[PDB]
């Protein structure tokens, strides 16, 4: 309806990005810094200056980065590894403050909630880490029988959503109950892995989820009532969803056939734009701090930066 460029503003190169659906290899900091996991290194790229930094490189043969996530203030970076560590990195100092172990298998997903960092694993378990204290491992949430590939705290901290290659979506309370750590909800309707998980920024209890190749749907939920408010065939595995306040839209990333981004109007779920370019499947979307730009990372070893939510 308005002008949404059909091409990316910038195309960063992402050589040796690992073409593995379950990983979460890109994140955009409040400080305008893109973190990007390419095989066994993480690169930082300022969208302000254009400066590039190789933050770290794994030490051991065969080890690679399996997830990254910035802390809110953008000065520390969490990094999950194929060797089941959650490392914590001070980005200015360029030092590694912690190397937290607890998981039995690779750590593919990460989400922050203040000083609690939540980590998910190929084992199916989710761990809460109090990164301030010595015994970092303060909770275990066990609601998945296979890889936790989607993990996101609600903006208001009241809920944590997790998505799995067991095709489950769980919504966790922020604090255990009498039963201990048990989901408030468990949605079984997806028929494929659910890596795409995102909270509506302007509707507290509303969650969007997206399914893998055998599912292909985007689903919207009320996590209070348990209702599916909407299911849309996206015709392609859905790797990531973001919400945009700017125009009240969602954007999702896809693979085969067209490897496109699709922008949808909420709550009508009408298709606004398709953003073509990527020549292989999209792996991840992440959003800039001003909300104007989405970064897509794909298996064609590029990051495209789309100015698709510009204001006035």
């Amino acid at each position: 309806c308005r002008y949404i460029p059909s091409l990316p503003d910038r195309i960063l190169d992402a050589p040796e990005i690992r073409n593995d659906y379950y990983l979460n290899l890109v994140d955009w900091s409040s400080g305008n810094v893109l973190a990007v996991a390419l095989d066994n290194s993480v690169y930082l790229w300022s969208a302000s200056s254009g400066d590039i930094l190789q933050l770290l490189q794994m030490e051991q043969p065969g080890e690679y980065i399996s997830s990254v996530a910035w802390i809110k203030e953008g000065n520390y970076l969490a990094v999950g590894t194929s060797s089941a560590e959650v490392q914590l990195w001070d980005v200015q100092q360029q030092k590694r403050l912690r190397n937290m172990t607890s998981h039995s298998a690779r750590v593919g997903s990460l989400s922050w909630n203040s000083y609690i960092l939540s980590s998910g694993s190929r084992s199916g378990h989710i761990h809460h880490h109090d990164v301030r204290v010595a015994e970092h491992h303060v909770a275990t949430l066990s609601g998945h029988s296979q890889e936790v590939c989607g993990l996101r705290w609600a903006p208001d901290g009241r809920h944590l959503a997790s998505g799995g290659n067991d095709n489950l979506v769980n919504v966790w309370p922020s604090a255990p109950g009498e039963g201990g750590w048990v989901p408030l909800q468990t949605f079984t309707q997806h028929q494929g892995a659910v890596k795409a998980v995102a909270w509506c920024p302007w509707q507290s209890n509303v969650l969007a989820t997206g399914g893998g190749t055998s599912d292909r749907h985007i689903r919207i939920w009320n996590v209070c009532s348990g209702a599916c408010l909407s299911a849309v065939d996206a015709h392609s595995q859905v790797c990531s969803i973001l919400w945009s306040p700017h125009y009240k839209e969602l954007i999702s990333g896809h693979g085969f056939a067209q490897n496109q981004l699709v922008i949808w109007k909420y709550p009508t779920m009408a298709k606004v734009a398709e953003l073509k370019g990527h020549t292989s499947r999209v792996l991840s979307l992440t959003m800039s701090p001003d909300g104007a730009t989405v970064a897509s990372a794909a298996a064609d070893e590029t990051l495209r930066l789309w100015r698709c939510f510009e204001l006035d």
Binding site: Y21, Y22, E147, N165, A193, T213, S214
Partner: peptide, 7 residues
Amino acid sequence: LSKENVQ
């Protein structure tokens, strides 16, 4: 499973 990494 590598279900979502299969061709």
